[PDB]
Amino acid sequence: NIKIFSGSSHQDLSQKIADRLGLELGKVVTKKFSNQETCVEIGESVRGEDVYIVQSGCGEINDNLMELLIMINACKIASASRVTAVIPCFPYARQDKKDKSRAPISAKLVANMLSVAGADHIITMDLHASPIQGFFDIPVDNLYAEPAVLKWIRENISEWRNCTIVSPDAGGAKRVTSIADRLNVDFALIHKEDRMVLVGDVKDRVAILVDDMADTCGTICHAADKLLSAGATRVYAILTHGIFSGPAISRINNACFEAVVVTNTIPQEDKMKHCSKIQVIDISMILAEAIRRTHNGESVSYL
Amino acid sequence: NIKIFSGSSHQDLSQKIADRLGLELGKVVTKKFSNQETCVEIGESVRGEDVYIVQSGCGEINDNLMELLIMINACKIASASRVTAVIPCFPYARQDKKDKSRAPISAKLVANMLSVAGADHIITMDLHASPIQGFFDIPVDNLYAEPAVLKWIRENISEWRNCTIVSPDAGGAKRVTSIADRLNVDFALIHKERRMVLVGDVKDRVAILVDDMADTCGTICHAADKLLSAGATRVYAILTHGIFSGPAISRINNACFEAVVVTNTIPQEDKMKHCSKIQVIDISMILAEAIRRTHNGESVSYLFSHVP
Amino acid sequence: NIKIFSGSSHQDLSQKIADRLGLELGKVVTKKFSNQETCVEIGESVRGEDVYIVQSGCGEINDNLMELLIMINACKIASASRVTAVIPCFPYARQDKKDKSRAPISAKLVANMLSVAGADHIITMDLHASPIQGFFDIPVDNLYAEPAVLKWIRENISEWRNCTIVSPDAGGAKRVTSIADRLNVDFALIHKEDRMVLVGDVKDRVAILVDDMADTCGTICHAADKLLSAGATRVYAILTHGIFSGPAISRINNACFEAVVVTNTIPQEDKMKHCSKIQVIDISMILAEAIRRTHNGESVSYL
Amino acid sequence: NIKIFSGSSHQDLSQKIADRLGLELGKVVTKKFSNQETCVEIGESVRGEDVYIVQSGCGEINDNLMELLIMINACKIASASRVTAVIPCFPYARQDKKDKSRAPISAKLVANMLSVAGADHIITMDLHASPIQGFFDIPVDNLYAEPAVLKWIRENISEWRNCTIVSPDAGGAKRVTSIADRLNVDFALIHKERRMVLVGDVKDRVAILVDDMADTCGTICHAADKLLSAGATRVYAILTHGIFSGPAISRINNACFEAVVVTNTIPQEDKMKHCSKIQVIDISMILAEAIRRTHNGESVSYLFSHVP
Amino acid sequence: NIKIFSGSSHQDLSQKIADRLGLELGKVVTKKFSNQETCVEIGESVRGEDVYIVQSGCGEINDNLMELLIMINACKIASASRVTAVIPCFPYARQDKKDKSRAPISAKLVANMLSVAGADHIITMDLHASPIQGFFDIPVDNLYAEPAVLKWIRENISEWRNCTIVSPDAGGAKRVTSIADRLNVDFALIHKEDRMVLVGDVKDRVAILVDDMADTCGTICHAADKLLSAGATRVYAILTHGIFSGPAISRINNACFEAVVVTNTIPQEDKMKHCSKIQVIDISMILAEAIRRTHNGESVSYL
Amino acid sequence: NIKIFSGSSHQDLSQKIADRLGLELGKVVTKKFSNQETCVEIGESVRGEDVYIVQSGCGEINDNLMELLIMINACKIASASRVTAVIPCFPYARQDKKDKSRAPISAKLVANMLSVAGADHIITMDLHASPIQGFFDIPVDNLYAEPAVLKWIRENISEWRNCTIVSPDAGGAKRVTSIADRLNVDFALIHKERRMVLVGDVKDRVAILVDDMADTCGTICHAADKLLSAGATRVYAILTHGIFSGPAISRINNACFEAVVVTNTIPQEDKMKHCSKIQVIDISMILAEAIRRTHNGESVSYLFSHVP
């Protein structure tokens, strides 16, 4: 009854999920015309089946979006019983408000686009902001990296019991306080004035920069510099969604971090090779467990 | 062309907005069925008219929301050209994410209800979480009370050049930082773990608590003690939406605030008889300016930093 | 597979339904913030389940509506397989037309609101007017009190075989003729001119005022006075939905009725104590039987 | 700005309405594919124009409805500003509730079909059941023929001050009572059990049967006998929509009516050649006034008691 | 679980389908009021059932459309689990574009109408043009007469291996080339200038006019005349959907055709009697097989 | 009232259209997040304005489509009166039917995406398959490049009175026949079986290949050889949309075309540096005329046979 397809050139998260549920990825012919046009063909019957599509991540976010949507549509009009988008890293997630601008709410657009394409259900992990669940009318099961992040800090940072979790921006206070509370450590927060400012006890104690995602690393790199000026013993970088394009990769190595943790929502294989301090948290079991429980009607709230 | 209406019998902000535009409020025949059903009649044509309905700060949120929905419908099926719901204090705004609970996202529900009732446009002020514009498909104008607040601090607080803007929770950091920056001053941040912890310098500085709303004032009072504990000279509380239900008035009067400042999105006339500390920023002109501009197609974003 | 929640402070109709199907009401935490805001939390997994919500009836119709809608939404975005609103007394049912006014069609609003909230199906009893089924695009199963009303008249009114069923208004002719036809008795009808008018043989015969609902009782009380002036032996009052607020309760006792029948669509417990002539028809078996048959795909048309 | 069109070839009411507004009917190229498919062409731009399409009383309801739907679509995808379907006699109106049967609510279906075809507005007259405005989300103007009827009774019936307004069924009580009250006279009510039973005094009074429509006239003729049986001096029948299909003309001519009065929502030109009793109230001005007002944004509710 | 209703006076295709699946057509009371108004009543419970409606074809296309839609709606609001429209001959299919006119896209209207009425799925055969699948948001399973047409040409036309398949219009090139390719024969095409023009080798070889549908036959009759002037040995006429109204019937007999093949998407029984050269391809097994496989979640792509 | 915007940085057709209407392009602040996310800002009010957004021929179709969608949304939630997406070359148009495959109908998907993003209207040119207007519910204006093509043939080809209009495939017959008829000349038809087969006379005639687009030019080059094989004097290729990706420029330069003619729906400035054969029909005036007319409510269908 259950069927899993991968949505890209990228099949390393998708294949990991299918193995854990004892399945083979669905047979799909995906091609790109010389004029950049995406061609997708479901090479099997998905009729009456419970279909799951895991998004790709070749670095290009529009191509990945379009193939995601094309696949959901291809499956819907082929009488799939239910289509879920399994999108650990929600595209355009930053654009969830106008921000004192004539700016799009692109997160709401993408939700409208996922809905109109045919999606009946969304599985995602650690949304930038949580109200993006409210952009959909369909059920959204948003998973948390929180348990997986906490487990790493406890098992890798030795001097954690008296460390400090730090937000790289103003709009990250909620997330770092929560991480701090569970570990009974202190928290701090950075705000770029541009001169950077720090608020919270960081002197002679392990500092861990936890954030949802870093693109150019420009913010998180200067965040490490500041923390070291403020006298933190050592510094870390936890980034659930690791986009890491352009100057980021090199910026991290010239940076002082003892370790830079990520989750394989975006494949670090080619970049782990160009940076040794990086470590990946496997989020496939969490995604596989959330697919089985969704298909069986079992509680995902435990996860 | 323009036509303003009010909800229930709490017609003060509506009248204030109506006054500033040189208009009368439109006639509504509205009593409640002893059954608790609301009956509305629109006592005049709205055919091809640019209608504005102002949500009433009476005090029963489900009654108010229902009446606002009923009036939006009445005008839409009476062939109004456009119905704009002017909702200074957006109901159920605090319920905008499931929050690792199995809860409804009530903000989205109210957004869907407003939409199907026939609403074409939204005018609102300082959404608890701004991302609520994303809960609609029709355009939303989210007005900032920030400018009006900054103007109040500059003239009512002498030590404003050296004060500290404080967030009572961790979800108000993006709000306190931007205010501190426009005044070019320090910011602080209180986080209640469940004890309050403060991060940022407030020693020998006036501290100004900034929030979107105050409801039982439990948090804002324990934050006043905390700030004065940490070396704050004096504590101000500034709220956009002042609900002050339950023990809040008892919370405010015994609290060590110099002053508690609220806009008149929720009426404060009675609450100032029982509480001297409460001062009111008049927002009616910002709302009036927003309606005028929406009608003439002129820039509403001009209000986002500039008090009319 | 089947799950039943109650929608209010009111759990006397809801618990009766759950007992009859051998169930416990679902665990739900409902709270009202000091600023009258409703907070609802489904304290269990409703995923893959066939969910039924029975509306509350603490006298307040907006609060009951909002919690009804909040619960349907809470269940829908928590991947409930199907949500039904079990609303014996359809809110705002009177407002099903403009009536030569710039008035809302609030019954259509409420239907739009129930739909947009997530409802897939509606169970209701004796709608004010029947076209309210046509306000929805989802299936509506409207049950009839008619069999339960007829059974009472036969088993309680001794001199029924030659009685007269009377409509308190002009727009009730259809309902009273039907009740009269099934019992092979005569019918009559009242119309307020305000001076009241009567049409139909009522002299020296049992009179039974049958209506869908009475709020202030103002109409139905003066209807009893008129019938007694026109010389009816004794007078009754059948009101499926008993709202009975404000002056109504006292108006009924100073009224001449031998009995005032209702159905427990709205709880009379506290008011039966303040009026002895009242009798309640239990509509729980009809609602419970209509839930089981809806869940099993069995015919409800028999009911 | 205004642009009126007609359906099929039954272009009399359309022309009458067009005449009263000083307009020509818009060019439509419309023949039927021998296959029974309808082909419509709009022989002119409607771009940014306020379009009105009048449903034709030709006589084949599914053909008429389809053509009305096709024309609404053509205008909408030709960038009309607004398309209003003017449907004097609303099709499938008698199917508005399931009725303890497993039947479709056809009224709602026609309402959904009109809506998705692209209709922005509805102008109609005396809906069999009024609650059909509730079957739409777009605004509906339900016109009353009542005023025109009352004016007809006052001048054509001398005994009107002492007559009795009769409902032929039990679903027409809310219609006969309101008419009786405006004339300040008695009302009666016939109920066919399945025999007719009459309640209310009609002795030595002119009796006036009032209905929304007449179709085979079975009911209205057995009601005429019944009334004269009960002591009625003479019987009139007044209908808003006069369909008169099947044996109705044979029913009318042998029936003891003094006169059978119908509006021209359904054409009566041929039916008066074969039946002398039939008199026509012209409704074209009420419809013309309704279109004019809808265009200028003036009060249409003025027509609800006042004949233009 | 499966239920089949016929949508008209016409029950010869519908009954053939039900027999092949071992079923009886659903009990339905359909009536037409003296004012041409359609009355339909589902004389049984369709609750929780997988419902299929096969359209009628009494020659009238609006009456058939309205009863089709009325039945889909009647079933949807009676809690049918799934409603499919089985419409071998898609109504208004010609009107799929404006054609340099202010013309309706009536095919899109009808799709909107089928959707809004309640349909969840469409089964159809050899659409005029294929993008009509794209007019729906629901799944559309469009079947092909191609295999059934090819089988007839091979088994009835003796000299086929060197014949020529001819399009009666310009917008039929795609269809005839495909038929020609599968049989390894040549193709030709006619275009009315009105003087007719021919392009493609037709001399002294069997000619077969293949088209989707002919109404007045005006085009296809003159197409036969031209082909005979151009010197084709014998001429045929393959028309999947045989509408054949007005002058068509007589035009075919005065025409020179050796045979005129059709499919019983539109009943030829009364007209086969008025023309002997006509032969019908039975499309009931294809429709019955497509219903069973849709209901069981099996592949229809094989068909 | 009118306001034109462009996509990405390919602002040539937008400027050309803007020039012909005596307007500047509206300010857009648009860089791409190194993450490949597009960020758009509308650097001016669009409140109550008739907005037009021109899809950019930059070359990355999913980026272009996304940016077009993002800009449509930005304008809609900034209370524009109307947003019209001007899409000369409609993306994913070749995917309009499943084609006995289990494929998406991408045309409909793009149509749904444009619709929910907030589009009120579509202006496009020569849809690969025209039936794409049927994929929308909002009005679509499908412009013909046909007139501009016919004008090009009449003046650039001397032998046009005796030429042959050729379809490179079998899906272009309804396009080549109508063109041949307006010039009153012969038509031909190439069908690649998978070898090309030609039907129709081309002996000692100039042959003109007519298509909706050219992409790798595989087909159009093998059709040129085929035509010259069959006795064609010389071969022209005329395309509305000239994409020329992959080996097309190598395909064109070695091919026996006299000339390859394209409209400027997709920019050709660079492609003419590398290929002399390529000539450009300017379509900007047809698009400018179409926008002007859409704004003033004047007939756009006038463009369907007549070059402005």
Residue numbers in the entry:
A (entry chain A), C (entry chain A), E (entry chain A): 3 to 195, 203 to 312
B (entry chain B), D (entry chain B), F (entry chain B): 3 to 196, 204 to 317
What does the paper say about this structure?
We determined the crystal structures of the E43T, D65N, A87T, M115T and Q133P mutations at a resolution of 3.0 Å, 2.14 Å, 3.3 Å, 2.11 Å and 2.74 Å, respectively, with 2 molecules in each asymmetric unit. Overall, the structures of all the five structures are highly similar to that of the wild type PRS1 with RMSD listed in S2 Table. In the Q133P structure, the Gln133 replaced by Pro133 destroys the hydrogen bond interaction between Gln133 and Asp98 in the PRS1, which might reduce the restraint of the catalytic flexible loop. The MD simulation result indicates that there are fewer contacts between the Pro133 in Q133P mutant and the catalytic flexible loop. The Q133P mutant influences the catalytic flexible loop due to the loss of hydrogen bonds, consequently results in a loss of function.
